[PDB]
A paper describes a structure:
To investigate the mechanism of NiV neutralization by 41-6, we determined a cryo-EM structure of the NiV-RBP ectodomain homotetramer bound to the Fab fragment of 41-6 at a 2.88 Å overall resolution. Given resolution limitations and the structural basis of physiological viral-host infection, we resolved a Cryo-EM of a single antibody (41-6 Fab)-bound homotetramer NiV-RBP, which showed that the two head regions distant from the viral membrane form an asymmetric dimer. The “neck” domain of chain B (bound with 41-6) has a reverse and parallel folding, and subsequently, a linker connects the head domain to expose the binding epitopes facing upward to 41-6. However, the “neck” domain of chain A (unbound with 41-6) is non-antiparallelly connected to the linker and head domains, with epitopes for 41-6 binding facing the opposite direction. The 41-6 heavy chain binds to NiV-RBP with 960 Å2 of surface area, and the light chain buries 113 Å2, resulting in a total buried surface area of 1073 Å2. Besides, the CDRH3 region is likely to be a key area involved in the binding with NiV-RBP, with multiple hydrogen bonds formed (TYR116CDRH3- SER242NiV-RBP, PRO107CDRH3-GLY506NiV-RBP, and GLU101CDRH3- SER239NiV-RBP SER241NiV-RBP, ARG242NiV-RBP). Additionally, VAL105CDRH3, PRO107CDRH3, and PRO109CDRH3 insert into 3 hydrophobic pockets, respectively. Our structural analysis of the complex revealed that 41-6 interacts with the RBP mainly via the insertion of its CDRH3 into the pockets in the central cavity, a mode of binding similar to that of receptor proteins. The CDRH3 of 41-6 was observed to bear a resemblance to the GH loop of EFNB2, both in shape and insertion angle into the hydrophobic pocket of NiV-RBP. The 41-6 epitope is highly conserved between NiV and HeV, thus explaining the antibody’s ability to exhibit cross-neutralization activity.
Residue numbers in the entry:
A (entry chain D): 1 to 216
B (entry chain C): 1 to 238
C (entry chain B): 131 to 601
D (entry chain A): 132 to 601
Write the structure that this text describes.
Amino acid sequence: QSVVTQPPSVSAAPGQKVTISCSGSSSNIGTNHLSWYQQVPGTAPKLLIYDNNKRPSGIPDRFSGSKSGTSASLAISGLQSEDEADYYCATWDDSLHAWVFGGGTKLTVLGQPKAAPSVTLFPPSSEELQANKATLVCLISDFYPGAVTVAWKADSSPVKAGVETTTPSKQSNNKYAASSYLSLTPEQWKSHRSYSCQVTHEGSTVEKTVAPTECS
Amino acid sequence: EVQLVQSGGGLVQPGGSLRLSCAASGFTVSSNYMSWVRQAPGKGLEWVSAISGSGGSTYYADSVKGRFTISRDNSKNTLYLQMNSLRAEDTAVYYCARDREDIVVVPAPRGYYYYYYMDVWGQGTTVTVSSASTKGPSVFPLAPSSKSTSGGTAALGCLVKDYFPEPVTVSWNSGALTSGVHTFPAVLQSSGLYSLSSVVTVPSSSLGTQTYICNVNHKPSNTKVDKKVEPKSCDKTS
Amino acid sequence: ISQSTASINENVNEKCKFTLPPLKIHECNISCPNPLPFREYRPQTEGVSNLVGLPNNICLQKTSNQILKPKLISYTLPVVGQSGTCITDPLLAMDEGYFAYSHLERIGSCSRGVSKQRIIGVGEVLDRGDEVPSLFMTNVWTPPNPNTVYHCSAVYNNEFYYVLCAVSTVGDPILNSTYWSGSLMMTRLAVKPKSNGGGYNQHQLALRSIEKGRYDKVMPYGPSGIKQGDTLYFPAVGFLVRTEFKYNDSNCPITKCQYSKPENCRLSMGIRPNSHYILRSGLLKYNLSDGENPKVVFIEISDQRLSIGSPSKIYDSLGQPVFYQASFSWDTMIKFGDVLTVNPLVVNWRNNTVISRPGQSQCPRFNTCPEICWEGVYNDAFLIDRINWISAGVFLDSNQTAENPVFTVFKDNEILYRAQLASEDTNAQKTITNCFLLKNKIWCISLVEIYDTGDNVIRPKLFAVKIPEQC
Amino acid sequence: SQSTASINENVNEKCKFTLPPLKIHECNISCPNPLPFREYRPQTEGVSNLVGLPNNICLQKTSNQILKPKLISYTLPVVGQSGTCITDPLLAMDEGYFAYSHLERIGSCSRGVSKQRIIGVGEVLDRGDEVPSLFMTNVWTPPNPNTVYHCSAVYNNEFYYVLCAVSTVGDPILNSTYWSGSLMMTRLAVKPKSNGGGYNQHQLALRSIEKGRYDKVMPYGPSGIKQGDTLYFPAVGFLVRTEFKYNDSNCPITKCQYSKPENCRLSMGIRPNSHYILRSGLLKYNLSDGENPKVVFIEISDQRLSIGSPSKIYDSLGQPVFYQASFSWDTMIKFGDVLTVNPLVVNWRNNTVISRPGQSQCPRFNTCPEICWEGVYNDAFLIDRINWISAGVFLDSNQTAENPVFTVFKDNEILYRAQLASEDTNAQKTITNCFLLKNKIWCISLVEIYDTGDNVIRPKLFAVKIPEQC
């Protein structure tokens, strides 16, 4: 289909201004008007802008839309804590006869004391290999805000097969927290020299490397 | 007031069928278009299908054409969605929402304006296309590493892998200290299973002095596996 | 002696021989008991005929008397039925008592509903016993892909309507004109169809050769055209590349307007000021006796009062063709007049001050100043007099909103009498007026797109209006 | 010499003198197909027969103009040639279909040259603005229009059974002795297919005819009924006059002074020395009889007996209502419930308000025996059975056939009226067939309106919604 593109993740301080662009073809955005949807995770999507600049009844004025040519925009000024969500531009394609949603903009406002990223690493023991499975465990928490990225290097080769990185999750300290798991075999565990949990949070990159000589 | 309510979501085996419903409140679905939007966990919104306000037009996304069937009952005031031949990529939360279209006639060669939006969204129920069990977890202790044992705080934990379904009960010392316990969210494996860990930030001086017991319990399958969480250093076979 | 006798024999043999075509019982004077009046036997004085000759005297004063009494005859076309259909792009040609009609039929919403049908239907205009010239659609064509047939246009010629349309796999080929192929289809439809015709009833004429000249793409554009003998004149538009639109910029009537520029009427010859193509109107020539597969020749319109190629209508009224061109740019006064010459096309555009079309904010109604806009509607006018030069059509009486369709009757400098066809806030967009003669009365059938606010669909409503004779 | 005058005589005999004579009834007239293709309709809904749910009408006697008769689209909309007249109309509606037949006649209307007989059936659809009109789907034309006289029609089971009388002696009423008694039945499908001419239009030969006691039977009247598999056309039977039993004590001559008590017996033939007597009735036609189904005549019961005039049995609100035209001294409208079909006893209503126009012998509002054969067919469809309210188009002049007024009436009361034309507008034969469209009582009513000075002669259809509110 015509996958209308957005910035996947932009971030700004509270009170600041951010503008969320929305670029696609001429058959869908150039011909037909566009509509905006914020979507807090775990919550129904919410209508923000339609007709590229109007609002439904009950939206504050700090959500501003635009459309220029085959591209559109969502300006968000004066960030608050509940404006941190995913922002979806949606329009109808007269060619595909379909709704076309945007790729999603994870707007990362602040709103809580910025949390330094904390990264921790604990390996599987003798027991997991005996069961025929080896699973890496990396635990990341105490970080504000969210939108964390955990990369994986086994001898500096980027490994993303078998990596399952969770979402940043609200804890009892209301911080962001995510876990990652690399499902492997004991053979692929002992076939390498090192395993690194490279955790990048908005540029804050932490790489913790253990050896395959330790069992928990 | 004006609200859509889903029903009929839940766990389904792959290739099968599940019919979702959309209880409509505050209006009539005969006058407006209605649409289904899904979202897999980890992706953005994806449109699925649309039924026409009065008329019989059924639109489908190009990946779901010929597998899903949208219909409605005007007497019941309920949008349906007959999903058939369910692939595992249909594992999502399906949102029924109306597509309220606003058209004015404008003195122009384009004739009419037609900005066009979805406003009233349903709660959205979960379609889970997977296998099924009542599997008790595979309990493993999680002992600190070399950059986690001789530090300032000790992140003592316990691995909860290979269980289904949710939830799971994990306490420490039969609940004698529940403080600081990072109960991680369950992640969807490539086995149709959830898997988590549960780590606690105790001091490193408390290692070998205070007994911390990750008491795992699974209440539906009567599964409890109590593991002694101890500090491991490097297993050296030399 | 005997030779003169034989000459008498031969002359009797030559003169008193009755080798004759068969008698016609209706032509001859027939005298049956308790008779009916014979009054006059003339063809096309019994049904619906064109405006030709000397019709009945229409009312000529300007009056405040509601004298136009329109009759909704919309049931005579397939515009009714289920209300989940939005009915778009109508068309209404009328020659000699036969019509053509064509709409696109979409299921659901007007904008994105699934395209059901492009019915291209011809028929007969007649009085169907209800004392009102109604339509009677018999022969109906529907193409195998109604999303590719755009901008049809229709001409009647010898028991067929010929309908020329544009085959566009890239949407409305004005709007995506740089990627259009220019391919056209000619549908020939019998107005009195034979049972078991096969090639007589509905035929497809393959147009493999277009004469454009300096234009890159031409397209039929507007409802109805004319025939002149064996030659069809489809109203049309030329797609001229803007860099080749040679046009001296000082020609623009920038005086009497402080806000125009010497660029404007050069710029607004395209749909947007940097349009790759410029829409110049014209005709398409289809001379039937060119041979097997006659070619289509574009005739560019002359540069007098030149504006953007809008949907055009050449129609034969009272002996001489009248060309109409809608005002899809700044010259918002109505742009129509008698055709001086057809090839090359030169129209004596009427100096019309009173009839204008509504457009949106940039070039509204009653605007003369050269602005850049692609704005306005096809509101048609038909010629119903030449001694006084009266015309009639349906026009949307509002400055900037596409509403209030009013059938009105006007000179070049005066509106005589009106009839609003609906409520003042009735959204209406494209009106097509054709007039004709029914027992030497000037009846005008006025198709009007109307947007029903309840059903949220667009639906053509026909208004057979008799042009009244007194006041 | 001699050969000179021989050639001269032979040439002047033969090279001159084109053929005078006119065979009328012998030369089949071929005209083009008057409706080759059905009018394009956008799959609009049909109508249903007037049965069941009492959808409310005005039943008060209102003087207000509450009827709105839409002059609607004619049955066969072609362009009329000048001087051409259209006569002998038939309009039979049952179960959302009509049948239609007219004679297209060059010259005059009464005695002119007849150029074609239309016999056509179709659908009574909604025309589009919630008004019904007749959309012709099938039309048959006889090879000779000068033979086919007095058709009748009955809907049954995706066909419309049109029974006609094949004459070669002119009007088999008027040349009844010399009339051969042959009939024909034309089966016209109402959903005509592409191929399959036997399915589309079928001509049913009637070589077994149970006249019973009668000498010649023919269909006579527009519209009949079905009952299951059995068609019951209206008819008239020609019985030899001296065979007709009629005690002159049963001629209602009390409260009169100018009725001889044999007038009832005399007037049942055309003229009171006619060879035949016209007895109204039905023609049974059981379709389940075989490949040669016989046509049983069913004589009408001998109560209030008049000359067999063209009549109409119709099924309105469950029970069949028979209408018989008043071509006799008995001029009041003579219609009512069919108590039993075979034998045919009909409870006639005691109407004191509806009649027909006839000549000076038997005018409008005549209940006294005079010898006459005059009057017009103005039927009445039953619209409300509970109050016995009926509706039809009745001419509203005493001695002349003019002013066609749509009327809704009871047995003692005309409720509310509607002129269909001006007061001096001549009209003859009106065929009202009320029915249900969207549970509204609509009455598509043909009227043979004659416009004198102009306006090439056709009948004028009139869809009339019976008003719900007074």
